[PDB]
Design a protein around this ligand. Structure first.
Ligand SMILES: [Zn+2]
Ligand SMILES: [Zn+2]
Ligand SMILES: [Zn+2]
Ligand SMILES: [Zn+2]
Lengths: 116, 116, 117
């Protein structure tokens, strides 16, 4: 009687819910991907900056020690801080992003096609 | 003797409405975490970009002073690396954070009021 | 007819328990990914702050050496530079949201539907 109408309702609601969860999972995956990419770029930008900063300080302290050695001849050593141990680590969540997209596609096999 | 089926329907509906509730909470927490990650990633991107610009300014000022000192020293008796190309990109996932918060609210329309 | 109804109820319960299972796995993977992001964002933020401090130290030492060279050259015959110590990288705290996700992942077990025969 009404039991059948209730079963149709549950199934429809449940299939609606899953559809929305699928969309939510795929958006989560997207958001975690864009974070992964930008976090890693920013890590690499920092690590490139560090290497080029070490290079610049190496060149500066060389020139300064020359100038001080020339002032010695005309009239103790300049040692700048080492900033090459500083490193930005990268993040690897590609496994979790894949898993989210997998479950998003897998949830199609969780839908209800009731017996007419 | 259709009592078992109606009590099963009531169980399914309660369990479902419970589950969706928990998911709605999980979706909101996700959206929150992505929002805080977006804010901090973007602040840290800017901090790096502000550093890089004021570092190019400083090295400019140094190389100027060094060239003046080397000319002075010749009369009594350098070019260093550019890092302005180093730039931290920013992230835009406010679209995906929206879509999570939308689906969290929209799941209220997936809930079940059983008929009787 | 009441056979079809019962078999439909079984189907609904098995699909539902299926779906929830997959979602639990998805919530755990989300929590993982936010955890690894939080750790790496925070390590990067500290690396930048440690770089800023050591850089301000190096520029202090350079401008000191340059001012001495300029005073020597004036005796044979302060001009300083930009402050960066102000620059600071914030840290992120989402351990509350990660905890909640794993909480909800476990709590969904109480939403499942049991062997009724
Ligand atoms: Zn969809
Ligand atoms: Zn000497
Ligand atoms: Zn934001
Ligand atoms: Zn030159």
């Amino acid at each position: 009687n009404v039991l059948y109408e209730n079963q149709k309702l549950i199934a429809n609601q449940f299939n609606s819910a899953i559809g929305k969860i699928q969309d939510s999972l795929s958006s989560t995956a997207s958001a975690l991907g864009k974070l992964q990419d930008v976090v890693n770029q920013n890590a690499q930008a920092l690590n490139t900056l560090v290497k080029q900063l070490s290079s610049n300080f190496g060149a500066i302290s060389s020139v300064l020690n020359d100038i001080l050695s020339r002032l010695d001849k005309v009239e103790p050593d300049v040692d700048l801080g080492d900033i090459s141990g500083i490193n930005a680590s990268v993040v690897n969540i590609q496994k979790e992003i894949d898993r989210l997209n997998e479950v998003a596609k897998n949830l199609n096999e969780s839908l209800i096609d009731l017996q007419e």
